[PDB]
Amino acid sequence: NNHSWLIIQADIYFATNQYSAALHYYLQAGAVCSDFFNKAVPPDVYTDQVIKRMIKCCSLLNCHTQVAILCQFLREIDYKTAFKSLQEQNSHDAMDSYYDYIWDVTILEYLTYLHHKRGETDKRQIAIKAIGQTELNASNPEEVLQLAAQRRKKKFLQAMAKLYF
Amino acid sequence: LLLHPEEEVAEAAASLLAICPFPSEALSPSQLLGLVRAGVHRFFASLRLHGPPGVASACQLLTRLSQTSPAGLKAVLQLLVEGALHRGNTELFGGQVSRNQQEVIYNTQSLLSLLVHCCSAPGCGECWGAPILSPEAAKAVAVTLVESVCPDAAGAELAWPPEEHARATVERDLRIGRRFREQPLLFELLKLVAAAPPALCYCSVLLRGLLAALLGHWEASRHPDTTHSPWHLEASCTLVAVMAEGSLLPPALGNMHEVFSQLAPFEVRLLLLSVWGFLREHGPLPQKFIFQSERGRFIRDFSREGGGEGGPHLAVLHSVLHRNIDRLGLFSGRFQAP
Amino acid sequence: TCWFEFLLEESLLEKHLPVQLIVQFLEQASKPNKRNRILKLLALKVAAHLKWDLDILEKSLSVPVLNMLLNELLCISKVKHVDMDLATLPPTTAMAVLLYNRWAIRTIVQSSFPVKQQMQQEKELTENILKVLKEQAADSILVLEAALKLNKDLKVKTEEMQCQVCYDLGAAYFQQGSTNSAVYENAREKFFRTKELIAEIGSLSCTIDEKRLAGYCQACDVLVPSLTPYSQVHICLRSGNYQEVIQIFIEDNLTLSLPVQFRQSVLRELFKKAQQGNEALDEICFKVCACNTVRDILEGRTISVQFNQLFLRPNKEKI
């Protein structure tokens, strides 16, 4: 139950194209740092480099909805990678049901746009309902939005760590 | 193996695990979390098939898991509360979608006893004394409750809004009320949350929608008395009772649940609106509770707050009493200033 | 059967043998002198024909109409109330003065009573009237007290008048008592007083709510005691004799007489008193809790979190 060593071993499994193990031990370090993602993971452990290695591993495992939702964990939201991976149609991560973890209005708007382009009416309606949420509105006084971000971060991290362990 | 289908191997593994020591260094987060999920699954399944007698193994394990570390404590509390409130493991506790009540009380006994065991601080403290529930465990139960009932947490500020907000949040408040009527264990957990002093503040959203579903009901209750809505009367008394136990209300103002069975709906609605007004002028924030290290408990002292003894809000209550001296005259010994 | 018809004849009121007539006459008289005087006289006549029953007029007629009618009667009668003393006053003038003070105290009592939720002007006038009587409630209380004390002597029984005035004065004391407990003490005495009068005359005549007086007596018996198990537990908690308190609950489990929430609330108060100090109180909290636990078993209700918190370290004494 050290977090730096779970990170180190996640990186070691990462370099050797063991991306499932890299995700496993990245998530292990993250859940050690918080209390099962109940708290907020300290920024000095889930750093931008770690988030990027994780996002690459999730892409190579074809978990592209997970890629979109991970892309918003950075200090600046990396819209380009999430947009490209959301354009993928071969994903293995329960694309629609995972939408509750999207808190970015731009990313949801982009997803609704693809669903309109591809004719996925049910996923379009799901994305629209996700956008049509009062707490998700971009005009909230900077506190409902931050709390929404933290709670979606927590739910995402804990369901992810369940999938990997 | 605690997921293995045949029951005898499952119990044998569980009874090994309950007594088999955890590794000396620590439990890996994968190991810790897999053990915790297996333990709660055994506990829940042990109970579904055996009931209260046959869960001790799992319970021991879970308790042993819950004292491992705050990460394991929060994980087991969150997973036990979530599994208690899932569409499965809900019919054991009176959850909606006929079952015997007796078994429900005693299943709930096992679950709540486990939670108290996990929550309570280990380690003669007098011959009659009781161990102190920890604040943080009830805080975690509180946040898991609020995320299970009203996941948005759109009112995540603890200070209460003006009573005009209630008509802005009608759907959310009705959702919380519907959930509380559907799953009675919720109140038990609230009482458990209330059994620790501060954590009920972190359920404030719940309670605010809860009071407004109650207030809303008392809005539209056209019946001349209070007993034509049994569940709502019991929920309101339990809420004031839980708020008064959680020390969100003063003793004089919190005792009003005693008269609620002899009141008209508008009278109790004005009483609950005085509840709302008090919660507005004071608010459930953890900083007012002070840690008495002599007994080691968080205490809420209204006297130092200033006007905490219901300066004007007791005016409404006393006006109720005077209006109802014909029936509530004897009850007047419940709401005195001292 | 209208306002105009009644003002025409001087004897059609006898053929009518009323509160609607009162309010119509008052509204016509107050609409923006001989006709006004005649209407006021007719209103006084019908109000007297109602035998001066304050309850019916209070429930039918609103604050401003009845206030205007009584101000008018005080105008013809005497035309300051505190200094009159009603000693040298004629009996009709004295009864008018005491009736006005009684009505004022009754309305200031009924204003505090919570209720269900042109009109705006009437509300503003009622608010102004209530503020006026608030600024002069002490004078009305003193006048009622003097009238009760001065039992010198149409004409009705002095006992009925004194009983009604002391009952209203006691109600006013009870309403005042919410701010200050000591005032309650006075109320008790006066209530005891009317109790004696209630047992003295036994005459319906005047008419007071027996249930309300019984309730006031009950309330003063517990708030200011100076029987039932309920008040026994109240007295013992006031005294701190908790062992008989446990005994009373234990006897209750057989009868289930006390209300459940009373015991839940008293146990909660016991726990709250315990967590500050009085380390010996914890056993008490256990014991009552145990009975409550046991009681909660007999009615088929869940073991409280408090027993599950108490048996965490079981002991032979506990068991």
Side-chain angles (χ1 to χ4, degrees), chain A residues 1 6 24 27-29 31-32 34-36 38-39 133-135 144 147-148 151 155 158 161-162 165, chain B residues 26-34 37 70-71 74-75 78-79 82 143-144 147 151-154 156-157:
Chain A
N1 290 283
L6 287 157
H24 193 248
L27 291 163
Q28 279 197 96
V32 159
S34 56
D35 305 327
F36 193 40
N38 284 275
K39 304 162 42 44
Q133 281 182 300
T134 65
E135 54 156 348
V144 185
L147 290 167
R151 72 168 212 80
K155 264 201 81 189
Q158 296 181 0
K162 282 180 187 189
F165 52 76
Chain B
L27 264 173
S28 275
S30 61
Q31 275 192 294
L32 208 171
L33 204 78
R37 206 167 280 91
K74 286 218 180 221
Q78 161 182 356
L79 284 179
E82 284 167 3
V143 305
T144 312
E147 302 172 356
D152 56 15
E157 83 273 40

XYZ file of all heavy atoms in Angstrom, chain A residues 1 6 24 27-29 31-32 34-36 38-39 133-135 144 147-148 151 154-155 158 161-162 165, chain B residues 26-34 37 70-71 74-75 78-79 82 143-144 147 151-154 156-157, unseen atoms left out:
392
model
N 0.816 -1.203 0.000
C 0.000 0.000 0.000
C 0.855 1.260 0.000
O 0.626 2.176 0.793
C -0.962 -0.005 1.182
C -2.053 -1.031 1.027
O -3.005 -0.830 0.277
N -1.923 -2.140 1.729
N 3.237 1.650 -6.428
C 2.209 1.225 -7.368
C 2.312 2.010 -8.666
O 2.102 1.454 -9.748
C 0.815 1.375 -6.769
C 0.380 0.392 -5.677
C -0.734 0.980 -4.823
C -0.028 -0.941 -6.261
N -4.036 -1.241 -13.991
C -4.298 -1.842 -12.694
C -3.509 -1.129 -11.607
O -4.069 -0.706 -10.592
C -3.944 -3.325 -12.744
C -4.453 -4.119 -11.586
N -3.623 -4.681 -10.642
C -5.710 -4.492 -11.251
C -4.348 -5.339 -9.757
N -5.618 -5.242 -10.104
N -4.392 2.681 -11.081
C -5.593 2.775 -10.276
C -5.331 2.389 -8.830
O -5.923 2.971 -7.917
C -6.661 1.878 -10.872
C -7.188 2.351 -12.207
C -7.890 1.185 -12.864
C -8.098 3.529 -11.977
N -4.472 1.398 -8.598
C -4.128 1.046 -7.227
C -3.470 2.215 -6.507
O -3.817 2.519 -5.359
C -3.219 -0.182 -7.214
C -3.949 -1.504 -7.363
C -3.104 -2.686 -6.952
O -3.190 -3.166 -5.828
N -2.283 -3.164 -7.866
N -2.523 2.887 -7.156
C -1.892 4.029 -6.505
C -2.904 5.134 -6.246
O -2.889 5.774 -5.183
C -0.732 4.545 -7.353
N -6.184 4.859 -5.708
C -7.074 4.513 -4.603
C -6.346 4.489 -3.266
O -6.971 4.713 -2.228
C -7.755 3.172 -4.867
N -5.044 4.210 -3.253
C -4.285 4.381 -2.018
C -4.236 5.851 -1.618
O -4.384 6.191 -0.438
C -2.867 3.800 -2.150
C -1.939 4.422 -1.111
C -2.902 2.334 -1.935
N -6.205 8.598 -2.306
C -7.490 8.894 -1.704
C -7.868 7.728 -0.793
O -7.039 6.879 -0.462
C -8.522 9.142 -2.791
O -8.569 8.037 -3.662
N -9.118 7.670 -0.353
C -9.619 6.479 0.322
C -10.636 5.847 -0.616
O -11.845 6.034 -0.478
C -10.210 6.811 1.673
C -9.238 7.557 2.559
O -8.021 7.301 2.450
O -9.688 8.387 3.375
N -10.145 5.088 -1.598
C -11.025 4.475 -2.630
C -11.676 5.600 -3.431
O -12.862 5.491 -3.750
C -12.056 3.499 -2.060
C -12.742 2.645 -3.094
C -12.033 2.117 -4.160
C -14.093 2.352 -2.994
C -12.665 1.334 -5.113
C -14.722 1.563 -3.943
C -14.007 1.055 -5.000
N -12.805 8.240 -2.628
C -13.779 9.003 -1.854
C -13.310 10.430 -1.625
O -14.092 11.371 -1.785
C -14.042 8.327 -0.506
C -14.935 7.105 -0.626
O -16.159 7.215 -0.620
N -14.323 5.929 -0.719
N -12.045 10.608 -1.268
C -11.437 11.925 -1.197
C -11.030 12.395 -2.586
O -11.437 11.843 -3.611
C -10.216 11.929 -0.275
C -10.467 11.454 1.140
C -9.166 11.082 1.840
C -8.030 12.065 1.571
N -8.420 13.502 1.653
N -29.156 18.934 -17.683
C -29.103 18.779 -16.237
C -28.761 20.121 -15.608
O -27.842 20.808 -16.065
C -28.077 17.717 -15.836
C -28.574 16.290 -16.003
C -27.557 15.260 -15.553
O -26.446 15.197 -16.080
N -27.935 14.443 -14.575
N -29.508 20.491 -14.564
C -29.305 21.790 -13.927
C -27.932 21.903 -13.278
O -27.280 22.947 -13.396
C -30.402 22.042 -12.891
O -30.287 21.086 -11.829
C -31.776 21.917 -13.530
N -27.473 20.852 -12.594
C -26.163 20.900 -11.955
C -25.026 20.903 -12.965
O -23.910 21.311 -12.624
C -25.985 19.717 -11.005
C -26.220 18.373 -11.664
C -25.522 17.237 -10.943
O -24.678 17.516 -10.067
O -25.815 16.064 -11.258
N -21.082 24.480 -7.772
C -21.832 23.292 -8.168
C -21.086 22.549 -9.267
O -21.106 21.313 -9.328
C -23.258 23.677 -8.609
C -24.086 22.432 -8.902
C -23.925 24.528 -7.543
N -18.020 20.712 -7.606
C -18.501 19.553 -6.865
C -18.997 18.458 -7.798
O -18.766 17.270 -7.534
C -19.604 19.980 -5.899
C -19.106 20.831 -4.728
C -20.263 21.478 -3.993
C -18.271 19.988 -3.773
N -19.677 18.831 -8.883
C -20.058 17.841 -9.881
C -18.828 17.174 -10.475
O -18.786 15.949 -10.627
C -20.901 18.496 -10.973
N -17.397 14.690 -7.884
C -18.177 13.476 -7.668
C -18.167 12.576 -8.896
O -18.148 11.347 -8.757
C -19.613 13.802 -7.250
C -20.493 14.370 -8.326
C -21.942 14.373 -7.867
N -22.857 14.171 -8.985
C -23.126 12.991 -9.528
N -22.575 11.876 -9.075
N -23.965 12.929 -10.560
N -14.828 10.833 -8.757
C -14.860 9.733 -7.797
C -15.593 8.524 -8.359
O -15.082 7.401 -8.305
C -15.515 10.197 -6.497
N -16.800 8.728 -8.891
C -17.549 7.599 -9.426
C -16.786 6.918 -10.550
O -16.709 5.683 -10.595
C -18.921 8.044 -9.921
C -20.037 7.856 -8.923
C -21.385 7.830 -9.615
C -21.669 6.460 -10.207
N -22.876 6.465 -11.080
N -13.680 4.910 -9.117
C -14.055 3.695 -8.362
C -14.655 2.647 -9.310
O -14.337 1.471 -9.099
C -15.030 4.073 -7.249
C -14.435 4.987 -6.197
C -15.449 5.295 -5.128
O -16.583 4.826 -5.172
N -15.048 6.093 -4.158
N -11.654 1.198 -11.228
C -10.877 0.291 -10.395
C -11.637 -0.999 -10.112
O -11.020 -2.039 -9.867
C -10.489 0.991 -9.097
N -12.975 -0.951 -10.102
C -13.734 -2.197 -10.045
C -13.535 -3.020 -11.304
O -13.367 -4.242 -11.231
C -15.226 -1.945 -9.842
C -15.632 -1.613 -8.437
C -17.130 -1.388 -8.354
C -17.549 -0.878 -6.990
N -19.030 -0.871 -6.868
N -9.906 -4.083 -10.971
C -9.833 -4.949 -9.795
C -11.056 -4.791 -8.896
O -11.448 -5.725 -8.194
C -8.558 -4.693 -8.985
C -8.318 -3.250 -8.617
C -9.029 -2.646 -7.604
C -7.305 -2.535 -9.223
C -8.776 -1.342 -7.253
C -7.047 -1.233 -8.867
C -7.778 -0.638 -7.884
N 0.355 -5.562 5.097
C -0.854 -4.823 4.778
C -1.659 -5.618 3.763
O -1.256 -6.711 3.365
C -0.526 -3.433 4.236
N -2.791 -5.084 3.342
C -3.574 -5.670 2.268
C -3.447 -4.796 1.024
O -3.630 -3.577 1.099
C -5.037 -5.789 2.685
C -5.498 -7.124 3.248
C -6.915 -6.986 3.743
C -5.414 -8.176 2.185
N -3.126 -5.413 -0.112
C -3.024 -4.657 -1.350
C -4.382 -4.064 -1.711
O -5.417 -4.683 -1.459
C -2.541 -5.543 -2.490
O -1.135 -5.620 -2.515
N -4.407 -2.863 -2.297
C -5.700 -2.249 -2.632
C -6.549 -3.131 -3.509
O -7.772 -3.161 -3.355
C -5.297 -0.957 -3.346
C -3.937 -0.688 -2.876
C -3.276 -1.982 -2.612
N -5.925 -3.868 -4.423
C -6.651 -4.909 -5.135
C -7.086 -6.005 -4.177
O -8.248 -6.419 -4.179
C -5.782 -5.483 -6.257
O -4.594 -6.062 -5.738
N -6.161 -6.480 -3.337
C -6.510 -7.488 -2.343
C -7.545 -6.954 -1.370
O -8.554 -7.607 -1.106
C -5.272 -7.933 -1.570
C -4.441 -9.018 -2.204
C -3.422 -9.566 -1.227
O -2.503 -8.863 -0.806
N -3.582 -10.832 -0.859
N -7.297 -5.770 -0.810
C -8.234 -5.191 0.144
C -9.615 -5.037 -0.470
O -10.611 -5.405 0.149
C -7.714 -3.840 0.630
C -8.090 -3.319 2.016
C -7.269 -2.085 2.347
C -9.561 -3.004 2.108
N -9.697 -4.528 -1.695
C -11.001 -4.265 -2.288
C -11.699 -5.552 -2.707
O -12.924 -5.657 -2.596
C -10.852 -3.326 -3.477
C -12.116 -2.538 -3.793
C -12.246 -1.397 -2.810
C -12.089 -2.053 -5.221
N -10.948 -6.537 -3.205
C -11.553 -7.816 -3.543
C -12.022 -8.566 -2.316
O -13.095 -9.171 -2.318
N -15.236 -6.688 -1.204
C -16.397 -7.029 -2.020
C -16.853 -8.452 -1.752
O -18.054 -8.720 -1.647
C -16.084 -6.848 -3.499
C -17.307 -6.573 -4.338
C -16.925 -6.101 -5.729
N -16.560 -4.691 -5.752
C -15.329 -4.233 -5.578
N -14.309 -5.048 -5.381
N -15.115 -2.922 -5.603
N -8.375 3.420 7.202
C -9.499 4.276 6.795
C -9.929 4.061 5.363
O -11.111 4.240 5.056
C -8.960 5.696 7.018
C -7.480 5.544 7.200
C -7.291 4.203 7.814
N -9.008 3.679 4.476
C -9.405 3.320 3.118
C -10.315 2.102 3.121
O -11.379 2.107 2.488
C -8.167 3.064 2.260
N -13.694 3.068 4.819
C -14.592 3.807 3.938
C -15.117 2.928 2.812
O -16.288 3.035 2.432
C -13.882 5.035 3.378
C -13.701 6.150 4.389
C -13.903 7.510 3.748
C -13.711 8.623 4.761
N -14.725 9.704 4.602
N -14.270 2.040 2.278
C -14.703 1.124 1.229
C -15.775 0.161 1.723
O -16.777 -0.061 1.039
C -13.500 0.354 0.694
N -19.017 2.182 2.530
C -19.676 2.588 1.298
C -20.295 1.402 0.575
O -21.424 1.487 0.087
C -18.677 3.313 0.403
C -19.084 3.371 -1.050
C -18.054 4.042 -1.918
O -17.040 4.537 -1.436
N -18.308 4.061 -3.211
N -19.582 0.276 0.509
C -20.109 -0.883 -0.200
C -21.227 -1.564 0.572
O -22.173 -2.060 -0.038
C -18.985 -1.868 -0.504
C -18.058 -1.481 -1.659
C -16.970 -2.521 -1.855
C -18.858 -1.298 -2.933
N -24.192 0.784 0.083
C -24.681 0.712 -1.288
C -25.338 -0.631 -1.575
O -26.367 -0.691 -2.258
C -23.534 0.966 -2.262
C -23.116 2.415 -2.371
C -21.788 2.591 -3.086
O -21.212 1.586 -3.548
O -21.322 3.742 -3.197
N -22.516 10.694 3.230
C -22.289 11.038 1.832
C -22.725 9.910 0.916
O -23.273 10.161 -0.160
C -20.826 11.433 1.598
C -20.473 12.524 2.540
C -19.897 10.260 1.777
N -22.518 8.656 1.316
C -23.044 7.560 0.517
C -24.563 7.588 0.477
O -25.153 7.290 -0.563
C -22.543 6.220 1.045
O -21.126 6.282 1.242
C -22.853 5.132 0.060
N -25.552 10.395 -1.952
C -25.280 10.002 -3.334
C -26.178 8.861 -3.793
O -26.400 8.699 -4.996
C -23.813 9.611 -3.501
C -22.820 10.695 -3.125
C -21.382 10.200 -3.118
O -21.162 8.991 -3.339
O -20.471 11.023 -2.893
N -28.309 11.896 -6.138
C -26.895 11.861 -6.534
C -26.344 13.195 -6.998
O -25.127 13.401 -6.911
C -26.877 10.820 -7.661
C -28.247 10.863 -8.227
C -29.174 11.179 -7.090
N -27.188 14.105 -7.487
C -26.679 15.356 -8.043
C -25.989 16.195 -6.975
O -24.971 16.846 -7.244
C -27.813 16.143 -8.703
C -28.968 16.405 -7.764
O -28.794 16.240 -6.542
O -30.056 16.768 -8.252
N -26.535 16.190 -5.757
C -26.045 17.014 -4.653
C -25.998 18.487 -5.052
O -25.068 19.221 -4.717
C -24.679 16.529 -4.166
N -27.026 18.916 -5.791
C -27.074 20.282 -6.301
C -27.170 21.316 -5.189
O -26.830 22.483 -5.412
C -28.251 20.444 -7.264
N -25.372 21.187 -2.389
C -24.286 20.671 -1.563
C -23.736 21.687 -0.570
O -22.746 21.382 0.104
C -23.152 20.154 -2.445
N -24.319 22.878 -0.470
C -23.966 23.769 0.627
C -24.803 23.439 1.858
O -26.013 23.212 1.772
C -24.131 25.233 0.208
C -25.534 25.807 0.303
C -26.353 25.556 -0.946
O -26.264 24.445 -1.507
O -27.088 26.473 -1.368
